[PDB]
UniProtKB/Swiss-Prot annotation, chain A:
Coiled coil: none annotated. Residues 1-157 form the PCI domain. Keywords: Cytoplasm, Nucleus, Phosphoprotein, Signalosome. Component of the COP9 signalosome complex (CSN), a complex involved in various cellular and developmental processes. The CSN complex is an essential regulator of the ubiquitin (Ubl) conjugation pathway by mediating the deneddylation of the cullin subunits of SCF-type E3 ligase complexes, leading to decrease the Ubl ligase activity of SCF-type complexes such as SCF, CSA or DDB2. The complex is also involved in phosphorylation of p53/TP53, c-jun/JUN, IkappaBalpha/NFKBIA, ITPK1 and IRF8/ICSBP, possibly via its association with CK2 and PKD kinases. This is COP9 signalosome complex subunit 8. Belongs to the CSN8 family. One of its GO terms (cellular component) is cytosol. It comes from the Eukaryota. GO terms for biological process: activation of NF-kappaB-inducing kinase activity; COP9 signalosome assembly; negative regulation of cell population proliferation; protein deneddylation; protein neddylation; protein phosphorylation; regulation of protein neddylation. It is found in: Cytoplasm; Nucleus.
Curated annotation (Swiss-Prot), chain B:
Component of the CSN complex, composed of COPS1/GPS1, COPS2, COPS3, COPS4, COPS5, COPS6, COPS7 (COPS7A or COPS7B), COPS8 and COPS9 isoform 1. In the complex, it probably interacts directly with COPS1, COPS4, COPS8 and COPS9 isoform 1. Interacts with CK2 and PKD. Interacts with the translation initiation factor EIF3S6 and IKBKG. Interacts with ERCC6. This is COP9 signalosome complex subunit 3. Belongs to the CSN3 family. It holds the Pfam family PCI. It is found in: Cytoplasm; Nucleus. Keywords: Acetylation, Cytoplasm, Nucleus, Phosphoprotein, Signalosome. The gene is COPS3. GO terms for biological process: in utero embryonic development; protein deneddylation; protein neddylation; regulation of DNA damage response, signal transduction by p53 class mediator; regulation of protein neddylation; response to light stimulus; signal transduction; ubiquitin-dependent protein catabolic process. The lineage of its organism: Eukaryota, Metazoa, Chordata, Craniata, Vertebrata. Its main location: cytoplasm. It comes from the Eukaryota. Amplified and overexpressed in some osteosarcomas (OS), suggesting that it may participate in TP53 degradation in OS. Component of the COP9 signalosome complex (CSN), a complex involved in various cellular and developmental processes. The CSN complex is an essential regulator of the ubiquitin (Ubl) conjugation pathway by mediating the deneddylation of the cullin subunits of SCF-type E3 ligase complexes, leading to decrease the Ubl ligase activity of SCF-type complexes such as SCF, CSA or DDB2. The complex is also involved in phosphorylation of p53/TP53, c-jun/JUN, IkappaBalpha/NFKBIA, ITPK1 and IRF8/ICSBP, possibly via its association with CK2 and PKD kinases. The modification Phosphoserine is found at S405. It comes from Homo sapiens (Human). Widely expressed. Expressed at high level in heart and skeletal muscle.
Length: 172, 405
């Protein structure tokens, strides 16, 4: 819930500026939070708004834009391998873990909603975790597995005041 | 010399209470204040920004109206302070000077490098001159222009989602160049956020202005309309009948490439479209609308699957891949996954035998959520009816009326 007010205050700090350029931490936090909320258009426009000097000065923005492009292309293993390839600063650390587990939950929801029979390897690639613990876990939540063929088969998951207002409006 | 008498007269005329004399004397004495260039002490003086808003407004407008202003930062800070700590209601008399000052300010911000710095300032002016939040004004066009050129779309959303009823005449300074531009930059800002319905609505509203001539932005608005209509629908939406005859004779034959795009798109053939868009790349790149035409190319693969939904209960990936011609069963799974993720289709992938199954059971229309949606639609129709009734009641009282019948 603090992410919403953080976004509000960061956007306010970006809107008012001596020359329209805020601190690099502000850019990093704003772009990371835009990636967290799955709002790609605003994140891309913010990235294009960044002046070349400040974005070239720090490779943190470059890496976060790389993971943003990975999100754009919807390559989930790319998401899980890019997010753990660089060592990140403190100001952006406690938001990317939320990004990671939110994307994990979204991937689980997508698999449960769309796929009816998925090979265990592809499901493990989507989740980003080894096959064994994912298989046991989905066994507990209630997804039937299949050995030998190694297949996963997930299962899909006051009035009267309004009425008198309506009658009063219609009676004219 | 005359500055002392001018400021004193402003003092007693503002203290007396009656207002229009100030506005009619300031607008006809600009020559007096434009031949000093040393009235920086007169800008502040004893003129507080609260009570003497019009006096300093005229001074700032005159100071900022001269070409090639030497000092930008000082005037920027002065106008920022004036807008932030303004009066609120006294500005509503000299609306023309306010609009001119804001237009000059937007030009001076955009002229060097940066439109962004003024954005907030403009969003502070909007609320201090318009009578109601649903009241279109010329400054909205400047706000949209600065927003589009600053590549920060979000801050302009609150001033665009709300509908605009009635337009301020602002002493006969609101010509068509401030109304056609606003509804076109609105289409620009919405087409970049993938909200195609409202972008199409704004483009259509911009098309049907009454105009016995051909303008520049009208052609671009028509081109982006013909692109967006193909993007969202599968066909060109017919223009409303209340359109000027100029569009049916001049603008239509001028834009032939886009009509050819529409004609080819109507055949649902994803092969000839690539050749057509490759051949006519020069004009599209010149118009600088690249990105809204590749979306048209990608729309065929999203529409053919929806068309197949109406016929096939289930399919093998190979057959449907050959039908839609994306050259590979593997990419068919990717497209189906994207479609089901974005919610345009209700499909299921079954990889044990190469299956795409089409579950056409989206809703039963018996949950309380549907009742809540119906209630929400009712509370908007009721507001619309109330607004029309209020407008009719206002019309039935005008002394110009009652005598025509």
């Amino acid at each position: 819930f603090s992410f919403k007010k953080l976004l509000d205050q960061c956007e306010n700090q970006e809107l008012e500026a001596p020359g329209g350029i805020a601190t690099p931490p502000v850019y990093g936090q704003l772009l990371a939070l835009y990636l967290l909320h799955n709002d790609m258009n605003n994140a891309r426009y913010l990235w294009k708004r960044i002046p070349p000097a400040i974005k070239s000065a720090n490779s943190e923005l470059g890496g976060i834009w790389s993971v943003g492009q990975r999100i754009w292309q919807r390559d989930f293993p790319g998401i899980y391998t890019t997010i753990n390839a660089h060592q990140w600063s403190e100001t952006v650390q406690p938001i990317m873990e939320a990004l990671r587990d939110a994307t994990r939950r979204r991937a689980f929801a997508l698999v449960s909603q769309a796929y009816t029979s998925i090979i265990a390897d592809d499901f493990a690639a989507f989740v980003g975790l080894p096959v064994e613990e994912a298989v046991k876990g989905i066994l507990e939540q209630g997804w039937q597995a299949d050995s030998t063929t190694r297949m996963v088969l997930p299962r899909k998951p006051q009035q009267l005041a309004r009425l008198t207002d309506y009658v009063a409006f219609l009676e004219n | 010399s005359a500055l002392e008498q001018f400021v004193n007269s402003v003092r007693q005329l503002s203290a007396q209470g009656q207002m229009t004399q100030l506005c009619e004397l300031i607008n006809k004495s600009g020559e007096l204040l434009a031949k000093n260039l040393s009235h920086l002490d007169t800008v502040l003086g004893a003129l507080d920004v609260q009570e003497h808003s019009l006096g300093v407004l005229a001074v700032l407008f005159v100071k900022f109206s001269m070409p090639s202003v030497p000092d930008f930062e000082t005037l920027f800070s002065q106008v920022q302070l004036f807008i932030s700590t303004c009066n609120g209601e006294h500005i509503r008399y000299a609306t023309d000077t306010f609009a001119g000052l804001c237009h000059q300010l937007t030009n001076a911000l955009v002229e060097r490098k940066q439109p962004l710095r003024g954005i907030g300032i403009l969003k502070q002016a909007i609320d201090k001159m318009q009578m109601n939040t649903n009241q279109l004004t010329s400054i909205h066009a400047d706000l949209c222009q600065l927003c589009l050129l600053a590549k920060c779309f979000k801050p302009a959303l609150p001033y665009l989602d709300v509908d605009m009823m009635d337009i301020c005449k602002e002493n006969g300074a609101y010509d068509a160049k401030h109304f056609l531009c606003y509804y076109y930059y609105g289409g620009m800002i919405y087409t970049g956020l993938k909200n195609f319905e409202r972008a199409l609505y704004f483009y259509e509203q911009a098309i049907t202005t009454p105009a016995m001539a051909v303008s520049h932005i009208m052609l671009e608005s028509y081109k982006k309309y013909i692109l967006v209509s193909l993007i969202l629908l599968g066909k060109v939406q017919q223009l409303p009948k209340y359109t000027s005859q100029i569009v049916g004779r001049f603008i239509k034959p001028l834009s032939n490439a886009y009509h050819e795009l529409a004609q080819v798109y109507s055949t649902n053939n994803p092969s000839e479209l690539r050749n057509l868009v490759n051949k006519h790349s020069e004009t599209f790149t010149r118009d600088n609308n690249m990105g809204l035409v590749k979306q048209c190319l990608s729309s065929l693969y999203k529409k053919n699957i929806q068309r197949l939904t109406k016929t096939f209960l289930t399919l093998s990936l190979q057959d449907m891949a050959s039908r839609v011609q994306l050259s590979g069963p593997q990419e068919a799974e990717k497209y189906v996954l994207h479609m089901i993720e974005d919610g345009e289709i209700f499909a299921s992938i079954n990889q044990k035998d190469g299956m795409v199954s089409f579950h056409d059971n989206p809703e039963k229309y018996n949950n309380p959520a549907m009742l809540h949606n119906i209630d929400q639609e009712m509370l908007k129709c009721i507001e619309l009816d109330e607004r029309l009734k209020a407008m009719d009641q206002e019309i039935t009282v005008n002394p110009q009326f009652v005598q025509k019948s």
